[PDB]
Amino acid sequence: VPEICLNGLQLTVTVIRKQEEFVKILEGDVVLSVLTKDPDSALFVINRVNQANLIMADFEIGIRAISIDNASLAENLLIQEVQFLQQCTTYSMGIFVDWELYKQLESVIKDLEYNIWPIPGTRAHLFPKVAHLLHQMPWGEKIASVEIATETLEMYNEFMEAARQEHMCLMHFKSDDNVYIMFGNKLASHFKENGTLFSVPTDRTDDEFLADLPNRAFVLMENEIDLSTAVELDATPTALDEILIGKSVLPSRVLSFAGSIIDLMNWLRGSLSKHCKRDLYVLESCFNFLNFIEDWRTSEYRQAHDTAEILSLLLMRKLGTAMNFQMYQKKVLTELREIASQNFVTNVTTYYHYNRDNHTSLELKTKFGQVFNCMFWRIKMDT
Amino acid sequence: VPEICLNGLQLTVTVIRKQEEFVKILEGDVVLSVLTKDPDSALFVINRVNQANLIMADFEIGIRAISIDNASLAENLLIQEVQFLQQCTTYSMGIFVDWELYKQLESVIKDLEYNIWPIPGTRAHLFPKVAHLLHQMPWGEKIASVEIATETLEMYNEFMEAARQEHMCLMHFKSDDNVYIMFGNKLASHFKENGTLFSVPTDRTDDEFLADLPNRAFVLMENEIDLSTAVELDATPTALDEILIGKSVLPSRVLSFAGSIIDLMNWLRGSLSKHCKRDLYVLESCFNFLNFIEDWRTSEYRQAHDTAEILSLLLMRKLGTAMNFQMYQKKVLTELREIASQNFVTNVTTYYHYNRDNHTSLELKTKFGQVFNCMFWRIKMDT
Numbered sequence: 001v002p003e004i005c006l007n008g009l010q011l012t013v014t015v016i017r018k019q020e021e022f023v024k025i026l027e028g029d030v031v032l033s034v035l036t037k038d039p040d041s042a043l044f045v046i047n048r049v050n051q052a053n054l055i056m057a058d059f060e061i062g063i064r065a066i067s068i069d070n071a072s073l074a075e076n077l078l079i080q081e082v083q084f085l086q087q088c089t090t091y092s093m094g095i096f097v098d099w100e101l102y103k104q105l106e107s108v109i110k111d112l113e114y115n116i117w118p119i120p121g122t123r124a125h126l127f128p129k130v131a132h133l134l135h136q137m138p139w140g141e142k143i144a145s146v147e148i149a150t151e152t153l154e155m156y157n158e159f160m161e162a163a164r165q166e167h168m169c170l171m172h173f174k175s176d177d178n179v180y181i182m183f184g185n186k187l188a189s190h191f192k193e194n195g196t197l198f199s200v201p202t203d204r205t206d207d208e209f210l211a212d213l214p215n216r217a218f219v220l221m222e223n224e225i226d227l228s229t230a231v232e233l234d235a236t237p238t239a240l241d242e243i244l245i246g247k248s249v250l251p252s253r254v255l256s257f258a259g260s261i262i263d264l265m266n267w268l269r270g271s272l273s274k275h276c277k278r279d280l281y282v283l284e285s286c287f288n289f290l291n292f293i294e295d296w297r298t299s300e301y302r303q304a305h306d307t308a309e310i311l312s313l314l315l316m317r318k319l320g321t322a323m324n325f326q327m328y329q330k331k332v333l334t335e336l337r338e339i340a341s342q343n344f345v346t347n348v349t350t351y352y353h354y355n356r357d358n359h360t361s362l363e364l365k366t367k368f369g370q371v372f373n374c375m376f377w378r379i380k381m382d383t
Numbered sequence: 384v385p386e387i388c389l390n391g392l393q394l395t396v397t398v399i400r401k402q403e404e405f406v407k408i409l410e411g412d413v414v415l416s417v418l419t420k421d422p423d424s425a426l427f428v429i430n431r432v433n434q435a436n437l438i439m440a441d442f443e444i445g446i447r448a449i450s451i452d453n454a455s456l457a458e459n460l461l462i463q464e465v466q467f468l469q470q471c472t473t474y475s476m477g478i479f480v481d482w483e484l485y486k487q488l489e490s491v492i493k494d495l496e497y498n499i500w501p502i503p504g505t506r507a508h509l510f511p512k513v514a515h516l517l518h519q520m521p522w523g524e525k526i527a528s529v530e531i532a533t534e535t536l537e538m539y540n541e542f543m544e545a546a547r548q549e550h551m552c553l554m555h556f557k558s559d560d561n562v563y564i565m566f567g568n569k570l571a572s573h574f575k576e577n578g579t580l581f582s583v584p585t586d587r588t589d590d591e592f593l594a595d596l597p598n599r600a601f602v603l604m605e606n607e608i609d610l611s612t613a614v615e616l617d618a619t620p621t622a623l624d625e626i627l628i629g630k631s632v633l634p635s636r637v638l639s640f641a642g643s644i645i646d647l648m649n650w651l652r653g654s655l656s657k658h659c660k661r662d663l664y665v666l667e668s669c670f671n672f673l674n675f676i677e678d679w680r681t682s683e684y685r686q687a688h689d690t691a692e693i694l695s696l697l698l699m700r701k702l703g704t705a706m707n708f709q710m711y712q713k714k715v716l717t718e719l720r721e722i723a724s725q726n727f728v729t730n731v732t733t734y735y736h737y738n739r740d741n742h743t744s745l746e747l748k749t750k751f752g753q754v755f756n757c758m759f760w761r762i763k764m765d766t
């Protein structure tokens with residue numbers, strides 16, 4: 001047995017980081033690895049697979065989910081897991097890589113020659129829900145000038161594709177009113193211009209981010225769902241793991257990842273049907289399965305799933321009320337009071353009005369989509 | 384014989400536009416079609432193939448080159464040529480589509496199910512030569528703020544990839560000096576800001592474009608090479624066609640198109656070797672060639688060619704002094720006097736200094752690349 005199985009995976013960050021700080025190992029007979037930025041949402045899916053028995057088998061799928069905080073260390077950590085899963089593991093499946101890290105590391109994956117699959121992008125779940133929370137936001141009768149600050153240009157191309165589907169074309173004028181729709185955690189940090197600011201965070205927020213925003217800025221974020229007990233997840237009696245109690249998951253990082261696992265575990269039920277005998281598939285009676293592992297990327301096995309079909313199959317149907325994409329306004333009296341809420345399952349956007357200055361009637365304002373309906377791009381690189 | 388062979392291609396623009404207005408038919412036994420915006424450069428390449436005998440055969444390759452001025456009519460014109468080349472032509476090869484029109488029409492080409500191949504992009508020949516003319520431009524010792532206006536975001540991504548390879552990172556400040564690098568014909572039309580302007584036209588210029596620029600604006604364009612006689616093209620005695628005498632070609636649209644024809648006509652010499660008997664390959668002794676026409680997209684037949692290898696093979700080696708990418712400054716005394724010249728064959732950029740106010744010595748200024756050497760993007764959509 002070699003050295004990498006005894007010691008695990010190591011990083012030189014000039015601190016020698018041991019294995020148990022970054023990977024969250026959940027024990028299972030046929031392992032899997034996920035190279036992700038959000039590891040708490042990865043083990044919630046693989047907890048919900050084994051309690052549901054998607055593969056209707058005796059064994060349980062493990063996950064060795066690697067945390068990514070630095071994008072430059074994703075190339076080093078992809079080498080060490082391919083050097084782990086070939087050697088130390090008897091029944092491996094493959095490495096799932098996030099779509100931000102899949103497009104970065106395209107030269108590395110094709111030269112490594114292992115089963116490395118992409119997790120789909122979470123911006124297909126967020127940027128339609130950004131632009132639908134924009135489209136029915138109440139507003140005055142003044143058309144404003146929209147300047148959009150982004151972390152990359154792929155976030156600009158996926159936003160205005162989603163703005164075009166909601167029939168909004170956002171134009172910039174030489175107008176006194178301004179609108180700044182910012183995409184990223186580090187971008188809206190003590191900004192000084194006088195327009196209304198729509199901060200869209202692209203990762204998990206911390207206590208630096210809610211303090212460094214300007215006053216009366218809008219925050220377009222999703223709710224982290226706090227996991228405490230297993231009876232809050234489903235009325236069907238399951239068990240939540242002890243590594244997951246007290247942790248929080250993201251609904252974009254769950255539902256993008258659980259769209260690919262149900263495409264993979266329904267492949268695995270057919271691959272244990274022809275190769276293994278039962279009505280539970282016992283691994284002592286299973287021989288030579290996982291032969292052609294790249295065949296689930298072929299479209300006869302990869303299907304698109306509805307969000308209410310994912311939550312019903314994976315025995316987590318009580319999380320549909322807690323899966324929201326909300327808009328928060330930071331008003332220092334510092335308290336981020338709530339403006340909007342768009343649910344993930346049934347997309348019913350709900351706007352919250354607080355009756356300030358004691359009125360018995362409220363005139364309904366015109367929406368932002370009816371004002372900002374219907375070309376060259378001026379791009380400034382700044383730091 | 385059907386109706387489309389007798390009448391040809393027709394357009395409803397509400398004027399009936401006939402076949403002779405936009406299709407320039409050059410007569411040949413084994414035809415080809417090119418759906419391009421610049422049809423004068425496409426006819427020059429297929430003239431230079433038949434005088435060189437790349438396929439060493441007695442027949443000549445014809446071209447039925449389609450002119451594109453409207454991008455919305457490219458989807459209609461792609462249907463009518465697939466409906467032409469199957470029916471009216473005995474020996475067809477395929478439709479070449481420009482890379483601006485290939486990425487626009489990706490849904491239409493895969494449903495038409497014919498041999499439709501992309502012409503490679505001309506911005507691989509221009510945007511390195513934009514950024515190399517920038518990098519050794521003389522300049523003062525003030526770092527300026529760069530705001531870049533583009534027609535699409537694909538022109539911004541291909542420019543700052545080419546700016547990164549020349550080690551220039553262009554940052555925007557809140558500085559009093561400004562730099563406006565504009566990409567497009569319609570963009571720099573009577574602009575009013577006080578910074579220095581670098582207009583980069585993406586198509587052929589006309590007399591509206593040289594009048595509507597601001598004073599002391601910089602024009603980054605390539606020279607159209609005026610075709611008059613055949614002795615100016617090569618010292619080897621060839622003949623220039625009568626449709627091409629008095630027309631002008633573009634060196635980006637020639638060399639992107641002639642990179643793919645030498646990959647195709649060297650395929651055709653092997654496909655007439657195994658299928659046809661000779662040492663000149665007579666078409667009356669040729670039977671059942673052009674069988675597997677998609678095999679030249681496979682990389683055993685598609686090779687990269689140097690620009691001095693293209694001009695030596697195609698018998699146009701006297702054009703290499705006339706293939707330049709130049710920088711012009713419009714100075715109204717209206718006269719676009721010349722600043723720079725970068726050759727296409729041997730990339731020796733040459734900067735022209737005019738000794739105004741009668742000095743006997745000139746201090747050499749610091750270059751633009753040494754000033755502007757070494758991040759979020761703010762994007763404004765404007766019209």
Ligand SMILES: *[C@@H]1O[C@H](CO)[C@@H](O)[C@H](O)[C@H]1NC(C)=O
Nearest residue numbers: 012013069070071072073074
């Ligand atoms: C990430 O890795 C790079 C590798 O060059 C290193 O310079 C950097 O300090 C690391 N951390 C962050 C926070 O960027």
Ligand SMILES: *[C@@H]1O[C@H](CO)[C@@H](O)[C@H](O)[C@H]1NC(C)=O
Nearest residue numbers: 128129306308344345346347
């Ligand atoms: C919610 O929106 C998605 C697209 O974002 C759509 O596929 C889905 O049907 C909607 N859910 C409903 C109507 O329950």
Ligand SMILES: *[C@@H]1O[C@H](CO)[C@@H](O)[C@H](O)[C@H]1NC(C)=O
Nearest residue numbers: 354355356357358359360361
């Ligand atoms: C509204 O009523 C509450 C309850 O008395 C009071 O505190 C508040 O000042 C009132 N506001 C106005 C504008 O009268």
Ligand SMILES: *[C@@H]1O[C@H](CO)[C@@H](O)[C@H](O)[C@H]1NC(C)=O
Nearest residue numbers: 395396452453454455456457
């Ligand atoms: C191009 O075609 C479209 C088709 O809708 C038409 O509206 C337009 O007038 C044409 N011409 C130009 C110059 O855009």
Ligand SMILES: *[C@@H]1O[C@H](CO)[C@@H](O)[C@H](O)[C@H]1NC(C)=O
Nearest residue numbers: 511512689691727728729730
């Ligand atoms: C000119 O530049 C191209 C790249 O743009 C390069 O491939 C070529 O070798 C250069 N030509 C020379 C050195 O003659």
Ligand SMILES: *[C@@H]1O[C@H](CO)[C@@H](O)[C@H](O)[C@H]1NC(C)=O
Nearest residue numbers: 737738739740741742743744
């Ligand atoms: C430079 O010399 C020429 C030739 O006489 C003359 O026209 C011009 O005015 C001179 N310029 C200056 C600044 O003396």
